[PDB]
Design an enzyme around this catalytic site. Structure first.
Site, PDB file in Angstrom:
ATOM      1  N   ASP A 193      57.831  -2.962  49.246  1.00 14.71           N
ATOM      2  CA  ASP A 193      57.430  -2.967  47.832  1.00 14.71           C
ATOM      3  C   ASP A 193      56.962  -1.621  47.333  1.00 14.71           C
ATOM      4  O   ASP A 193      55.806  -1.206  47.542  1.00 14.71           O
ATOM      5  CB  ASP A 193      56.306  -3.986  47.630  1.00 14.71           C
ATOM      6  CG  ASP A 193      55.815  -4.153  46.225  1.00 14.71           C
ATOM      7  OD1 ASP A 193      56.364  -3.486  45.341  1.00 14.71           O
ATOM      8  OD2 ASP A 193      54.851  -4.982  46.023  1.00 14.71           O
ATOM      9  N   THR A 194      57.854  -0.895  46.615  1.00 19.44           N
ATOM     10  CA  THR A 194      57.506   0.422  46.057  1.00 19.44           C
ATOM     11  C   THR A 194      56.525   0.364  44.912  1.00 19.44           C
ATOM     12  O   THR A 194      55.933   1.393  44.562  1.00 19.44           O
ATOM     13  CB  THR A 194      58.757   1.180  45.553  1.00 19.44           C
ATOM     14  OG1 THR A 194      59.443   0.467  44.572  1.00 19.44           O
ATOM     15  CG2 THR A 194      59.738   1.410  46.714  1.00 19.44           C
ATOM     16  N   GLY A 195      56.305  -0.830  44.333  1.00 22.14           N
ATOM     17  CA  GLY A 195      55.283  -1.032  43.283  1.00 22.14           C
ATOM     18  C   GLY A 195      53.871  -1.180  43.800  1.00 22.14           C
ATOM     19  O   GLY A 195      52.929  -1.065  42.995  1.00 22.14           O
TER      20      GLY A 195
HETATM   21  C1  LIG Z   1      50.493  -5.880  45.775  1.00 22.63           C
HETATM   22  C2  LIG Z   1      49.388  -4.936  46.048  1.00 22.63           C
HETATM   23  C3  LIG Z   1      49.130  -4.515  47.357  1.00 22.63           C
HETATM   24  C4  LIG Z   1      48.041  -3.646  47.622  1.00 22.63           C
HETATM   25  C5  LIG Z   1      47.205  -3.220  46.630  1.00 22.63           C
HETATM   26  C6  LIG Z   1      47.451  -3.668  45.312  1.00 22.63           C
HETATM   27  C7  LIG Z   1      48.528  -4.496  45.018  1.00 22.63           C
HETATM   28  C8  LIG Z   1      48.690  -4.979  43.570  1.00 22.63           C
HETATM   29  N1  LIG Z   1      49.858  -4.313  42.945  1.00 22.63           N
HETATM   30  C9  LIG Z   1      50.819  -5.043  42.232  1.00 22.63           C
HETATM   31  O1  LIG Z   1      50.755  -6.302  42.099  1.00 22.63           O
HETATM   32  C10 LIG Z   1      51.917  -4.168  41.593  1.00 22.63           C
HETATM   33  N2  LIG Z   1      53.174  -4.943  41.488  1.00 22.63           N
HETATM   34  C11 LIG Z   1      53.931  -5.202  42.604  1.00 22.63           C
HETATM   35  O2  LIG Z   1      53.560  -4.737  43.702  1.00 22.63           O
HETATM   36  C12 LIG Z   1      55.156  -6.098  42.420  1.00 22.63           C
HETATM   37  O3  LIG Z   1      56.154  -5.644  43.332  1.00 22.63           O
HETATM   38  C13 LIG Z   1      54.741  -7.556  42.739  1.00 22.63           C
HETATM   39  C14 LIG Z   1      54.663  -7.855  44.300  1.00 22.63           C
HETATM   40  C15 LIG Z   1      54.589  -9.334  44.592  1.00 22.63           C
HETATM   41  C16 LIG Z   1      55.758 -10.020  45.046  1.00 22.63           C
HETATM   42  C17 LIG Z   1      55.675 -11.440  45.211  1.00 22.63           C
HETATM   43  C18 LIG Z   1      54.498 -12.159  44.947  1.00 22.63           C
HETATM   44  C19 LIG Z   1      53.369 -11.454  44.518  1.00 22.63           C
HETATM   45  C20 LIG Z   1      53.421 -10.082  44.325  1.00 22.63           C
HETATM   46  N3  LIG Z   1      55.826  -8.442  42.175  1.00 22.63           N
HETATM   47  C21 LIG Z   1      55.653  -9.049  41.012  1.00 22.63           C
HETATM   48  O4  LIG Z   1      54.562  -8.927  40.304  1.00 22.63           O
HETATM   49  C22 LIG Z   1      56.748  -9.960  40.571  1.00 22.63           C
HETATM   50  C23 LIG Z   1      57.214 -10.931  41.495  1.00 22.63           C
HETATM   51  C24 LIG Z   1      58.291 -11.792  41.136  1.00 22.63           C
HETATM   52  C25 LIG Z   1      58.803 -11.782  39.870  1.00 22.63           C
HETATM   53  C26 LIG Z   1      58.289 -10.863  38.908  1.00 22.63           C
HETATM   54  O5  LIG Z   1      58.848 -10.782  37.667  1.00 22.63           O
HETATM   55  C27 LIG Z   1      57.293  -9.891  39.254  1.00 22.63           C
HETATM   56  C28 LIG Z   1      56.921  -8.823  38.231  1.00 22.63           C
HETATM   57  C29 LIG Z   1      53.516  -5.473  40.117  1.00 22.63           C
HETATM   58  S1  LIG Z   1      52.052  -5.134  39.101  1.00 22.63           S
HETATM   59  C30 LIG Z   1      51.610  -3.694  40.142  1.00 22.63           C
HETATM   60  C31 LIG Z   1      52.520  -2.506  39.825  1.00 22.63           C
HETATM   61  C32 LIG Z   1      50.146  -3.259  39.944  1.00 22.63           C
END
Ligand SMILES: Cc1ccccc1CNC(=O)[C@H]1N(C(=O)[C@@H](O)[C@H](Cc2ccccc2)NC(=O)c2cccc(O)c2C)CSC1(C)C
Ligand SMILES: [Cl-]
Ligand SMILES: [Cl-]
Ligand SMILES: [Cl-]
Ligand SMILES: [Cl-]
Ligand SMILES: [Cl-]
Lengths: 99, 99
Positions: free
Chosen positions: A25-27
């Site tokens: 996950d690059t996000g």
């Molecule tokens: C995930 C993580 C790990 C460590 C520290 C903070 C974080 C929180 N960061 C985040 O949540 C970041 N995002 C991410 O990292 C995303 O890739 C997120 C990851 C994820 C996948 C499946 C279940 C639950 C989460 N995916 C989604 O939010 C997501 C999942 C499925 C469909 C959809 O339309 C979306 C936008 C999207 S918003 C963001 C850019 C801030």
């Protein structure tokens, strides 16, 4: 490896004595694992994204193997629906986004 | 380009004639943008991320230029923390993960 994005980029990882499936996950700035009773000292943290924030446990200097490639660093544990490998460990394995 | 991951992978996009900054996010199934106006038909939809579920507006068949590459597909609008380019459009521009 080269991994396409037609489906969720799920790979096998090794952490804490367990083999798991996890999302590349690059996000994500950091790495968060589904709830597991991992040993060691920890500190509380909140992380946020779509839907708001969750409380997790922060563990430091934890070995992780990702698809055969070794890493070591911070791992968060809590109520995530999916195991997620974020940028803190993706950089340690040389991962890039290419197009 | 080949984009390394020490910092968030942010790029400039053009959508509806307007330039915006957005995150290339391999953990997102969908593309989700902060509140904005888009032309044409939409319907309500729900998506879930790290914190739970949110309500979004779904716009289909929308052109988006991403770091110079053309895509045309579904764009969701609603209370996202950042503008997110997800797998539905990353696949259209030929993006892969590499290590
Ligand atoms: C995930 C993580 C790990 C460590 C520290 C903070 C974080 C929180 N960061 C985040 O949540 C970041 N995002 C991410 O990292 C995303 O890739 C997120 C990851 C994820 C996948 C499946 C279940 C639950 C989460 N995916 C989604 O939010 C997501 C999942 C499925 C469909 C959809 O339309 C979306 C936008 C999207 S918003 C963001 C850019 C801030
Ligand atoms: Cl357990
Ligand atoms: Cl070796
Ligand atoms: Cl780390
Ligand atoms: Cl912007
Ligand atoms: Cl699409």
């Amino acid at each position: 490896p080269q991994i396409t994005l037609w489906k969720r980029p799920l790979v096998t990882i090794r952490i804490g004595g367990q083999l798991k499936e996890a999302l590349l996950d690059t996000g994500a700035d950091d790495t968060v694992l589904e709830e597991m009773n991992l040993p060691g000292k920890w500190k509380p943290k909140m992380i946020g994204g779509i839907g708001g924030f969750i409380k997790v446990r922060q563990y430091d200097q934890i070995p992780v193997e990702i698809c055969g490639h070794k890493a070591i660093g911070t791992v968060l544990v809590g109520p995530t629906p999916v195991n997620i490998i974020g940028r803190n460990l993706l950089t340690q394995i040389g991962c890039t986004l290419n197009f």
